[PDB]
Write a protein that binds this DNA or RNA. Sequence first.
RNA 1: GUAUGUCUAAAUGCUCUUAUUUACUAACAAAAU
Lengths: 46, 107, 36, 54, 429, 54, 114, 198, 107, 97, 102, 45
Amino acid sequence: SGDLNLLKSWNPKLMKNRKKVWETEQDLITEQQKLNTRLKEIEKER
Amino acid sequence: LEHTLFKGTGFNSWEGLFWEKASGFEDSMQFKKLTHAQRTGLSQIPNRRFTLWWSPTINRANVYVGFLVQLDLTGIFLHGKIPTLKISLIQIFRAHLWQKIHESIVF
Amino acid sequence: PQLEARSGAKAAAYTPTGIEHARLLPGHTTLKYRKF
Amino acid sequence: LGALKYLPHAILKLLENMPHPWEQAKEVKVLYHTSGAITFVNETPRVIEPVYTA
Amino acid sequence: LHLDYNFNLKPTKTLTTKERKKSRLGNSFHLMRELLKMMKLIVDTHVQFRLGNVDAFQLADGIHYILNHIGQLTGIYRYKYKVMHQIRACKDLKHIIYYKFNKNLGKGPGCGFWQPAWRVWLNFLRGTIPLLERYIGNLITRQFEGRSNEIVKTTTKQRLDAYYDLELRNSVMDDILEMMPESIRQKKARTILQHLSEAWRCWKANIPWDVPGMPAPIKKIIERYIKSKADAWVSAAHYNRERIKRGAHVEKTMVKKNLGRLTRLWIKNEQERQRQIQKNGPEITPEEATTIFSVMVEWLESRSFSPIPFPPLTYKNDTKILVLALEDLKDVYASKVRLNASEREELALIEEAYDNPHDTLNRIKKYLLTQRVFKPVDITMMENYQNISPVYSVDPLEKITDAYLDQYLWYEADQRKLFPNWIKPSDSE
Amino acid sequence: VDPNIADYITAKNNVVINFKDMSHVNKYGLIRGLKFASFIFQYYGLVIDLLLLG
Amino acid sequence: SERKAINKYYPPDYNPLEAEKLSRKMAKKLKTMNKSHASIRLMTPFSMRCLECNEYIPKSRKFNGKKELLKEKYLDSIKIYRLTISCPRCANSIAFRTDPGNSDYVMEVGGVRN
Amino acid sequence: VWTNVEDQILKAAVQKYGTHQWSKVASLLQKKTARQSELRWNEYLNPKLNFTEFSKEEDAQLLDLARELPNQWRTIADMMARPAQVCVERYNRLLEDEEKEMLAEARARLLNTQGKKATRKIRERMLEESKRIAELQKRRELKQAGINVAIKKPKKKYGTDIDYNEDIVYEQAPMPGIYDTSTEDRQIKKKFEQFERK
Amino acid sequence: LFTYFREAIVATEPLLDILVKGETRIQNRVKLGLNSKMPTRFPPAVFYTPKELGGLGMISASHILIPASDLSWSKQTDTGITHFRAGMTHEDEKLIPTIFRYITTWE
Amino acid sequence: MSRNVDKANSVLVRFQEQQAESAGGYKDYSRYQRPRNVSKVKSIKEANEWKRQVSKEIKQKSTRIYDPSLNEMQIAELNDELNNLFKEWKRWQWHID
Amino acid sequence: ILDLEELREYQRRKRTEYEGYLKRNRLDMGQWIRYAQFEIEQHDMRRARSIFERALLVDSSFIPLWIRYIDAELKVKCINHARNLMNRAISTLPRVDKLWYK
Amino acid sequence: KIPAAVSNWKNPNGYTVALERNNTINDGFMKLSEALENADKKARQ
RNA sequence: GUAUGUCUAAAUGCUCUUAUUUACUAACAAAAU
């Protein structure tokens, strides 16, 4: 075999980890969007 | 299904069930190379899970010559050393799960 | 390195081990002979 | 430790002497190392063939 | 490793690796354990019977079960898998006996009649007695007095080749020693060995191994031994190939070696052929060639073939052709997920071409015009196990051009009727 | 074909073949692998066909 | 005795829950398990220079590192790790972090990427 | 595209490595490719190739060849003993930081006849030596107290080559045997006692 | 194999034999992974069941009752389809369909 | 549980150790960390063991700090570590008995 | 190398090293002579003598070893032993010129 | 005396070294050409 | 195939958290329509 790190959890370049990260971002991002819009609305009202 | 562990999952019926569903994953999918967005629409069924799925046929009582070991801290007989199956079983019944189940039932 | 070629083999005699080798087991006790 | 050599022989002997279902308990001849290391059932169980069959 | 009183051995903790290494018992000890377990099982049943725990009939049945189920009840077969025969026999007996015994009577447990099974097991044990006495006895001897100087054996598939090589080297050294006087020859031996190795390498490559300082005799001797090696090697390779063709227990590694070696041989042959050609002109005599040319010309005239021109800049379907070529190229990679560096480069090039069609076309044209010297074509050969094929991997940059040419020329032919009706593979059927 | 094109083809066939450590200039005989080679092969075979027929 | 061993022997009195509890009680006292910088084997993805002795440890070179958890996570629920290494020649502690925002690593006062 | 420093490095590597080992060399030159490297070497670097021009006769010969082996140009080159591209041309006729860093790397490589096992072993030896000296120092420090030097722990029944005398071969009892030898030996040994004392 | 010579397979017995063998080998590969190959522990369920019910989803051409014949009179002289040979496995009267019957013969 | 440490601190092993401690009195004073505040150790044997352990540690420290690359900062750090160890040892030689 | 014990430790180590090198390349004969020299330096004449003998046994047909040994014997003004050695050498190998000359 | 050869494939020590690493063709190769060119000319004319 | 080597003088109970893993090992193997 060649590159060992590819068979590690901690390795971020491992695909599973990347996927997890994306998911985290996606959820968090969505939340931000939800809140961001609200904030914008509030600003407009003001 | 009756061959498989399907009934052990505790679902009513095989309609609208799938594997490895997850979320959509395309925007951050340009790290790959001539993969055509997704490599295969077909589910790969990694054999660790395959064994588990067909565990109730693969491990079974009508065996020819399997030395029936009782698995560690569980009531799950293995008729011979079958490789991935055992690991899967252990994972399932981690942290003395069998005992917990039994005791829970009793309670 | 130690991946190394060589100079000579060996032949040194110790006390026999008394181990029951598989091949050493008896077989063809009868020796044949010629006619004369 | 030495006796492992003959333990399979011993096993074979004992098994051979298995009391048959028409027999509550068989007495059997026994050799045994005075050290207590191994015990051979010594007798070899012979029968009157027709009688045995019956 | 703790023994149950039922003889099922298993470990207390999870063993570290050193411990594991120390404590892997082998085919003797395990067999013995299995035997003991079996004994216990029959003995245990009788004990139970003696005690008020179980009826006589029940005891009999238990015994029968044990004897048939040896296979399931306890691993002997694991350690010695000719006990499998015995197991099979027992099963057969059960099948027979049960069918005889449950004729008018129905299916259920409670069939005694352990006799034939018992007999079978006894007979099996007979064989073991000897094997165990050699094995277990040997083990105990080792434990008391553990071997001095074992001798490995080159009749093994593994280690054979290396051993052979070593022997050859030794022989060569001996020959060289015989040849001429030396002072501090040990140092020189190494040098000689190195030289030999180099020669061998050259032979493998098909490089002529000419060194100026090498004196005639020594050099000659080295050459002879490399020839010998080749003879031994080539023949061996051939044998391996034959085996592969048959389907005769070839080692994966061995097969790979054969594929490689055979490829090398093929290459060597090719270059020899080339050399021969260079030496003694083409096989085709000039007159014959001329005649052929004339014939071709005549054919062309008959067909009234408009010769294919060089691609103009403002050719009608040029871009389309290029696109087609690009697509084709992609279709080499679009499937596979893995890509080496060269492949990646090729992909990049293709992408660039796609982006900038006009530029790429121009470049291609330029290449066609000017480029008469090219990058070297590396060849792998593939293992179609019957017969190996070559694979010529052309450089990514030139490859595109080649593809384009293929696309264009074929199209032109189709348009203009170069190939007649009868040459069928080219056709779309 | 255009003489230039022909020249290009011929040179292209006439390459340095490599393999591991050995390499050789392919001074004679068409290389099958290179993309256009198929066309060339076909053309060659046409000649053969013609010869066969008359 | 064999790596694929199905069942490890337990004593005849082994209340598993109780055993676990006991272990826990004797885990705070324990030397290993109650510590940071637990070992790991890893190849080096960055391909970098050891800052002390300028030893050019290249890509994919294997080392027995120490992985430790960084308490300050990335975003919220995706951990990041310090991965200690030693340079071959001089024994300077190189390390790096795995910030997964870029799908790559960050150097941590050890060496420099090049 | 090929820079001159890089070319030089490649050449150096080839003398260090081997004209049939184009992976290591490629690695050494971070931007250029393995299969490309070899090609480059073939083209420019190898001295036996006569990249320089030649007389009119040679040119004439080349042109003749071109006529009579229609642009079979590698073959022509081979015949000449010349490189190909150059021959073809003749026929037709009739950043800094990176450099610094790469050079440094390359230099380190080519010079150092080392790796894992070579570097490790020497280092280990050095460490051992250091340990030994530390031990000696410690004993010196605690000299007023009686102290014994620790022996190398045995692994499987070996000899400590101070005592016992190792596998002795005889003096071989000869004919002109004289007994002064023993005396001489004794005398020699007397001196070493004195040395020990001081 | 089958799409290329759809019609022309049926007649050649050697090819059929190879298919049977090849298929079996493939099956055993999977069973090699599971470190057994006990014929009961792999009922055709686990192989031929599609991936959409967790199986491997093989596409058998092995469960055909192969034409046997008088090998005395087969290579020699003339032939007719008499005596079928076993085909590939023990079945639970589970007639696994064969890819050929889902491919339209070339004629 | 690759690399041995995991195996050592696997639950079964721990349980075994506990059992040993209970019955017969096998402790491994290597295995547990030595306590910070002495005078929470009424037994003498335990104290002695602890002292021994600390001595061993000190010795280990000493062995390494005379290595050839003397100018490196690790050695310097250890010098303080060594001092600390010495202090600990001294403390362990308390005068209750 | 301050004390006697230290010297012993050093010397012992050296001897061990020499042994190790020998065990692999027993048939070397450069190593053996080096070892002999070391022994001589250490002023253990016995040891040196033994080493030389061992070397000779390994390779009797090696004049350099013989000559060096002779030199060593002579160096320590131990002439009679040296003479004996020379005689032995002569007996072993007449048709080598050098021993006789020596 | 035999030289100290240096391998183009192997350097155990990595010890660098200062670069230590027929024209007539058969009648055919001219004759063939003559046949060909001449033939071409004939075809043209 | 879960590497390895040196190094060794002779606070008590309590409970609560889980639909997981700071998990570790890579010796093993590597393809498409």
